[PDB]
Amino acid sequence: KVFGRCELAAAMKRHGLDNYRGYSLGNWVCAAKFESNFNTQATNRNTDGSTDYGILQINSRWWCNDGRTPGSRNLCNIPCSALLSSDITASVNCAKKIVSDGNGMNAWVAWRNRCKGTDVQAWIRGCRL
């Protein structure tokens, strides 16, 4: 499913993420825009054999099994495919883990490069929240 700016905000909120480990809701909508264009079906192969899954592009070398990445630790305990569903529950649940582990949202290359230190509140401008 391809989310609206505003609908995803609302939903990520509903799901415990507005200030989770201290990241504004914005930080989250941002990361997702630039990571997947609000498209939950999105996948991308890295060089090392691993694949990125869903709205937040969670990686299969650590987080979810997709049953074709070796090194694989499945710290999420979820099949990667789960992360592509129209319900983002699995992805959030997993993201909560990733972001807490130690590196905060730096774990997302795009957040760090394209979101970090910009006025991220701009992403929930307009929203009923």
UniProtKB/Swiss-Prot annotation:
CDD domains per record: LYZ_C (cd16897)
Cystine pairs: 6-127, 30-115, 64-80, 76-94
Tissue-by-tissue expression: In the egg white and polymorphonuclear leukocytes.
Single GO term (MF): identical protein binding
Keyword Hydrolase: yes
E.C. no: 3.2.1.17
GO CC annotation, single: extracellular space
GO biological process: cell wall macromolecule catabolic process; defense response to bacterium; defense response to Gram-negative bacterium; defense response to Gram-positive bacterium; killing of cells of another organism
Top-level enzyme category: hydrolase
Catalytic activities: Hydrolysis of (1->4)-beta-linkages between N-acetylmuramic acid and N-acetyl-D-glucosamine residues in a peptidoglycan and between N-acetyl-D-glucosamine residues in chitodextrins
Binding site residues for substrate: 101
UniProt entry keywords in alphabetical sequence: Allergen, Antimicrobial, Bacteriolytic enzyme, Disulfide bond, Glycosidase, Hydrolase, Secreted, Signal
Sequence ranges assigned to domain C-type lysozyme in this UniProt record: 1-129
Record has S-adenosyl-L-methionine as a keyword: no
Active site: 35, 52
Entry-linked Pfam families: Lys
Locations listed in the record: Secreted
Predominant cellular place of this UniProt entry's protein: secreted
Subunit note: Monomer.
Job of this protein: Lysozymes have primarily a bacteriolytic function; those in tissues and body fluids are associated with the monocyte-macrophage system and enhance the activity of immunoagents. Has bacteriolytic activity against M.luteus.
Family: Belongs to the glycosyl hydrolase 22 family.
Matching PANTHER family: LYSOZYME C
Protein name: Lysozyme C
High-level lineage: Eukaryota, Metazoa, Chordata, Craniata, Vertebrata
